[PDB]
């Protein structure tokens, strides 16, 4: 049996009512269950038998539907509900899951706090210099991070990673890591990361001198 969820993702504000749908290719009566999953964690059962709330789950989660058409509702979206929601049918075998609906939060703009870390002495002894720029607790997710070495704009030697949306405050954090050989690192004096973001009225630069 084929399980089809919609939408694939949605964005709502805290307090909004969220509606997610699951469509089964054939009748499954009430053998339809809902799960919540956050990045890096196991799924958690929310609702079984299409409407029965699992003990400990808050009452703002409710399910309805019968046959082929099912709805998961969140009546007042809370920040900790950011997650992907999965339906699953158990009418016979094989058990199969929907493709998931990602629920994301819209919130007010928050500027990043910006931090920079010079390479450790232990890493330098190994012959590599990683420089880390951290953007912490910002919203929305889009951010621009540029590296400058001795005032020259870099390309080609950095990698970025962004967190999932925070379950308490709905923000993101981002890291940008510049990696050079010890020799190339010792060719230059000033290392700086410049951050542009919607919540910053001007770009923020964090810099240090190799010494």
């Amino acid at each position: 049996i084929q399980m089809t969820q919609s939408p694939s993702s949605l964005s709502a504000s805290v307090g909004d009512r969220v509606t997610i749908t699951c469509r089964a290719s054939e009748n499954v009566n009430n053998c339809l269950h809902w799960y919540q999953q956050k990045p890096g964690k196991a799924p958690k059962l929310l609702i079984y038998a299409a409407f029965t709330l699992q003990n400990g789950v808050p009452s703002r989660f409710s399910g309805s539907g019968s046959g082929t058409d099912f709805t998961l509702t969140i009546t007042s979206l809370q920040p900790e509900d950011v997650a992907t929601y999965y339906c699953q049918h158990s009418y016979g075998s094989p058990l199969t899951f929907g493709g998931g609906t990602k629920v994301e939060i819209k919130r007010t703009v928050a500027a990043p706090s910006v931090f920079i870390f010079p390479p450790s002495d232990e890493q330098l002894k190994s012959g590599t210099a990683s420089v880390v720029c951290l953007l912490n607790n910002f919203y929305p997710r889009e951010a621009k991070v540029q590296w400058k070495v001795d005032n020259a704009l870099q390309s080609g030697n950095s990698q970025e990673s962004v967190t999932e949306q925070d379950s308490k405050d709905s923000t993101y954090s981002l890291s940008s890591t510049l990696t050079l050989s010890k020799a190339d690192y010792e060719k230059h004096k000033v290392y700086a990361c410049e951050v542009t973001h919607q919540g910053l009225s001007s770009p923020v630069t964090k810099s240090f001198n190799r010494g």
């Binding site: 799960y35 799924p43 899951f97 954090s173 890591t177 964090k206």
Partner: protein, 215 residues
């Protein structure tokens, strides 16, 4: 109620893997234990289950011939053996108790010819360059490991507020790297202790690094 699963592993193509799921806190024999795979793109896929009372099993047809599910009541432990491993078997493998209440934390299995490599761990030391207002950031850089995942805790799990462990990046070398950071009061860097605990189970590597302020 608890399900504890065996650790992450890299396996060569064509190898076999036997995953384990140790159940506790409930009558092992009276609950079906299912194995559910979660792979990028393929999503969640049930592979089969077993009722440890008489040991009756049941297998998704897609997985018949390669999968064997067993259970050992004496040790309240369920097993899943997957043979003739291929690249598309790369996934997190969950055991879950019967719908499925209570899931284990999953066993990440990477199918690859590359050798396991444990991480190098470096401090991201707090300095004036990592202060914002009265807040200081500090962290650990966990570089050059394979396969995923590394897990990071701080102060043996006692420090969790304000921690961000970033998703790993893939370096041009084909090794992984990530950072784990936390924000703390800048005023107490002299009296508080901050240690990152890094575990790379595929290599059984465990590292603790005390992160000291720089001046």
């Amino acid at each position: 109620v608890q399900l504890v699963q065996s650790g992450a592993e890299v396996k060569k193509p064509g190898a076999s893997v036997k995953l384990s799921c140790k159940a506790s806190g409930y009558t092992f024999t009276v609950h079906a234990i299912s194995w559910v795979r979660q792979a990028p793109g393929q999503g969640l896929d049930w592979m089969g289950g077993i009722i440890p009372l008489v040991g009756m099993t049941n297998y998704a047809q897609r997985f018949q011939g390669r999968v064997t599910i067993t259970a050992d009541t004496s040790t309240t432990t369920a097993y899943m053996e997957l043979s003739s491993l291929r690249s598309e078997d790369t996934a997190v493998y969950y055991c879950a108790r019967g719908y499925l209440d209570i899931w284990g934390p999953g066993t990440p299995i990477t199918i690859s010819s590359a050798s396991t490599k444990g991480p190098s761990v470096f401090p991201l030391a707090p300095s004036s360059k990592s202060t914002s207002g009265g807040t200081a950031a500090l962290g650990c850089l966990v570089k050059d490991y394979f396969p995923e995942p590394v897990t990071v805790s701080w102060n043996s799990g006692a420090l969790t507020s304000g921690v961000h462990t970033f998703p790993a990046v893939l370096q041009s070398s084909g090794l992984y790297s990530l950072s784990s950071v936390v924000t703390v009061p800048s005023s107490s860097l002299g009296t508080q202790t901050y240690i990152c605990n890094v575990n790379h189970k595929p290599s059984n590597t465990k590292v603790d690094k005390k992160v000291e302020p720089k001046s």
